[PDB]
Amino acid sequence: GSHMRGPNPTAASLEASAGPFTVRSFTVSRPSGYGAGTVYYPTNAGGTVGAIAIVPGYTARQSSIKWWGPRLASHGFVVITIDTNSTLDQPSSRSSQQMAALRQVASLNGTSSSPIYGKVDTARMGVMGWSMGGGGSLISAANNPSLKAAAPQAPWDSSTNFSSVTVPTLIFACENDSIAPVNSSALPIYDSMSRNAKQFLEINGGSHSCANSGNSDQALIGKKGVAWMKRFMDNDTRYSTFACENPNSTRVSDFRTANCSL
Numbered sequence: 262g263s264h265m266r267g268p269n270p271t272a273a274s275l276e277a278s279a280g281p282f283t284v285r286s287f288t289v290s291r292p293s294g295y296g297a298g299t300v301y302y303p304t305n306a307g308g309t310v311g312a313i314a315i316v317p318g319y320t321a322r323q324s325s326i327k328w329w330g331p332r333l334a335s336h337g338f339v340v341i342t343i344d345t346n347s348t349l350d351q352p353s354s355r356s357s358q359q360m361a362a363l364r365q366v367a368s369l370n371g372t373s374s375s376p377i378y379g380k381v382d383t384a385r386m387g388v389m390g391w392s393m394g395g396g397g398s399l400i401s402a403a404n405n406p407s408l409k410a411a412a413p414q415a416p417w418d419s420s421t422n423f424s425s426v427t428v429p430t431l432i433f434a435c436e437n438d439s440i441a442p443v444n445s446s447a448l449p450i451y452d453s454m455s456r457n458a459k460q461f462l463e464i465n466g467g468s469h470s471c472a473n474s475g476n477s478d479q480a481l482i483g484k485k486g487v488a489w490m491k492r493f494m495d496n497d498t499r500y501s502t503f504a505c506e507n508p509n510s511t512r513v514s515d516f517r518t519a520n521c522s523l
Contacts, residue, residue: 437466
């Protein structure tokens with residue numbers, strides 16, 4: 262059961278600011294269980310694509326995570342970036358709101374007036390998000406093991422125990438993070454997971470915002486995020502090497518991976 266879309270990938274095609282597909286977007290008129298949303302979608306994917314829901318961190322809005330919308334959608338995904346009901350929502354609330362955004366993407370897929378009418382395979386979903394939104398993605402993964410992939414960035418939760426997670430999980434970490442330090446957040450979270458395909462990519466000298474909109478590593482972080490979601494959401498074995506490989510880059514201060522075949 263694989264869903265291969267678009268051309269065979271290259272390091273160049275994955276590092277490029279845009280994938281093969283044309284992207285359009287819309288504002289969600291009446292958000293259902295979250296604050297606000299922008300849906301990014303390919304106009305010409307040539308098949309149905311999985312959906313990814315992306316949540317910001319405490320105080321933060323869609324602008325912090327917006328770069329993922331076009332980057333992922335242009336390789337064959339529907340991406341919803343959300344604002345939370347409150348900028349001060351905690352990780353459990355962020356998780357509920359992430360899953361509500363995936364639910365509304367499914368609703369719009371079934372809405373004849375929506376630009377994503379019949380564009381989504383609702384069987385193939387993924388979760389991403391920054392800091393408390395990264396915590397929220399891991400909670401979403403632990404509560405909903407049918408999710409095909411998770412790729413949180415600089416995750417924080419009040420607990421680091423995610424030992425139940427079976428969803429393929431890529432953690433972006435920021436080496437000099439002083440908000441959710443790697444040694445007390447991202448790494449203990451990574452270490453807790455013994456049941457899944459997983460990866461840990463730490464950005465050299467990165468602050469807490471090292472994977473946000475306006476970061477200086479979008480070629481490397483974009484290639485890894487796209488490759489992970491293509492490998493695991495689409496079961497697209499053309500991305501096994503990109504998804505699972507040590508990228509061998511002086512911008513990476515630490516690389517870890519388990520249960521990930523090349």
